[PDB]
Design a protein around this ligand. Sequence first.
Ligand SMILES: *Cc1c(COP(=O)(O)O)cnc(C)c1O
Ligand SMILES: *Cc1c(COP(=O)(O)O)cnc(C)c1O
Lengths: 399, 399
Amino acid sequence: HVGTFENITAAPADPILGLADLFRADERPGKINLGIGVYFDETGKIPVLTSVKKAEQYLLENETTKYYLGIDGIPEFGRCTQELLFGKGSALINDKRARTAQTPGGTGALRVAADFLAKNTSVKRVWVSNPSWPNHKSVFNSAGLEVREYAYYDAENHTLDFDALINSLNEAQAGDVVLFHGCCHNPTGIDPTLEQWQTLAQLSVEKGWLPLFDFAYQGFARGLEEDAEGLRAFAAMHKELIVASSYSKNFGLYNERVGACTLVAADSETVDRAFSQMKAAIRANYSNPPAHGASVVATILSNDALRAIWEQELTDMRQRIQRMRQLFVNTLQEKGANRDFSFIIKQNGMFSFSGLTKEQVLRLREEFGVYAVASGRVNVAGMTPDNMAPLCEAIVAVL
Amino acid sequence: HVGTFENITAAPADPILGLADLFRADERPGKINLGIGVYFDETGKIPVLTSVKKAEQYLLENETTKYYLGIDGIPEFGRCTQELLFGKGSALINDKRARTAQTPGGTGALRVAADFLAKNTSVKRVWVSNPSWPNHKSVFNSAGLEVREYAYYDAENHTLDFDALINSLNEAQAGDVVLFHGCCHNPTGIDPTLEQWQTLAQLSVEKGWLPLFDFAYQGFARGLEEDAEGLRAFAAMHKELIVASSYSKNFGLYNERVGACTLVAADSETVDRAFSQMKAAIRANYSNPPAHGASVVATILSNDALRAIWEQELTDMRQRIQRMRQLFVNTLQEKGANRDFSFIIKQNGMFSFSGLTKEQVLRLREEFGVYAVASGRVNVAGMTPDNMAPLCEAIVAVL
Ligand SMILES: *Cc1c(COP(=O)(O)O)cnc(C)c1O
Ligand SMILES: *Cc1c(COP(=O)(O)O)cnc(C)c1O
């Protein structure tokens, strides 16, 4: 009998995680990693936060069981997540209109929402920005949903093309899902202004879209509360919305897989009915979520002293990135770039669209050992005072 | 516009996890939990193994980063898993015919296999024992696979109905998946003998089935090596197979979600091609797996001292369950049961199929505070010297 696996064709590499694999294999001592979106400190390490180490020490000495969590995970994790998203006294919370499931990462939260929608509703289509995180298409396609692209980035002026965005989204019908990044747009670093958010919120209700927010970077743009303003403007207006959030980056907890999928409906009875189906989709996927990372997050947010430490550590990460954006721009001019790179200062979060071509990015890797994503997305949080000079000399050499 | 969530139908409660919720809500003193398949110790607690605490201490002191694992997880975890399943000197390992992905629990391994098969092969149908773990059907159905049932249990003789099993698999075609429990069948506790496994292995290769093994209880029947004899009979004869394994129960690591999906193909080049697509299916689901639980397992399995502790702790658990089996039978007799429950002593693992009707299980819950799954499955590992007599009086009362 001819084997079931004989005719399988190999998958292409992941544009982000395959780049990381090349980086590990590169033998050259001076290689620079500006690929995957993780935070590096000044010394070029990816450290464990001090708030996290303290919480893990508490867990080690006080955990008495590894008994299964419920399908939706740790209750306090869910409540603390809703408060971070919608605010201490939100009406969504007091009206019991939101339910949260702890998930394995923000990716897990996106797939759970996708599965939930495809199996329980009439949704067929998800609208994603052009460009976006590459894995968005793969998540939604694997759940059986069609993916459509709306306009976003103006590459000539390095800005949000708000007119193009609104014209492209006039083709999105009622009952379609539209995906927004909450803040720190991946890959462009360009977010809407509050006014623009408010314009989209009203347009969204008028046209009957189902908004889905991907919130992987809360706290890296301006602050925990400030970064949620766009989401809260939507939440004041809509009867239904979905939030897939991640704690991978703002807690430095990447490999423990800590995220949430939050469901909002018109009233408490509807959201409970809908959440029963979300729990079924989870049970048929990974059954119930991993405890260690979520327990760390809930321990930190629940304890005023740890939370104080964590917010300061997050502030330090946000400010180190802003210092590198400035240093990057200044050093490019010193190293002989005659192009204006000022737009990089106006971008938020870890990433900037460098403007480099695929051929230039390929040269940076092969000839200079500098690793960026083929779209020209560069991880500013991968820049340090020590690698800035070689990094900028390499960029000027390929311009 | 009308709400997207309004036409949603509520999902029923999970037959196992809903029971556990009912048990938590019950305020009657003396209630007894014989539902979900976790190990309880002699005091009715669900403890953390000593080997696990020691391993977690080492991780706390020595971890310097939470940087993302690769899509397929910790490499040493995969190699140690293959040795456990196939034996230290297996030809499968020497010929590099197997690849292992670390997954979030045994459920996550099953789902990853289902998504991989549905998208990359012409597999359309999965055959599962009747009865089986109720979540099997949900997992494969979530990928759009048809699930059929084969005969398994002789409810009259409390034995494997091997003749009916053979006859009911007559219509399973070449390229169909046939699912086998590796040991400690859930829910019946009845496993094939070695000769029966050898007969099934021959039949499987003649009919061209793709075998898929669900190994959630390795070490709870007779021992770690003995419990894998049936898998290893299949492995000696098949070019291709899939193994979904769990460390939830044999490490008491339930809520850390530690499992593995192992792919076996004819040769190294084929399994690597196939495994590239299994990685693509993981990336579109939860991206990469949770580190803490698998790090514990890998640390214990890699260190001779910790491993000898763990193997003794697993022996202790296995032996406690076997003593409860014998105590359960003796105490039913002392409390006046006329039905013969001797078959309980012949069954393996945590569960016995008691033979109680749905009506009798409901009476036990409502009238006596005794919680079993509605199929009559009772968790013997939830019985203690302290709750044995009240439990047995309750059962006798409903017979
Ligand atoms: C990192 C990221 C994710 C995935 O988060 P994980 O917690 O690693 O699964 C999802 N969306 C965006 C935009 C991201 O940047
Ligand atoms: C417990 C169990 C599973 C699920 O294992 P997890 O690691 O908890 O996801 C799968 N199959 C069987 C037969 C089980 O008993």
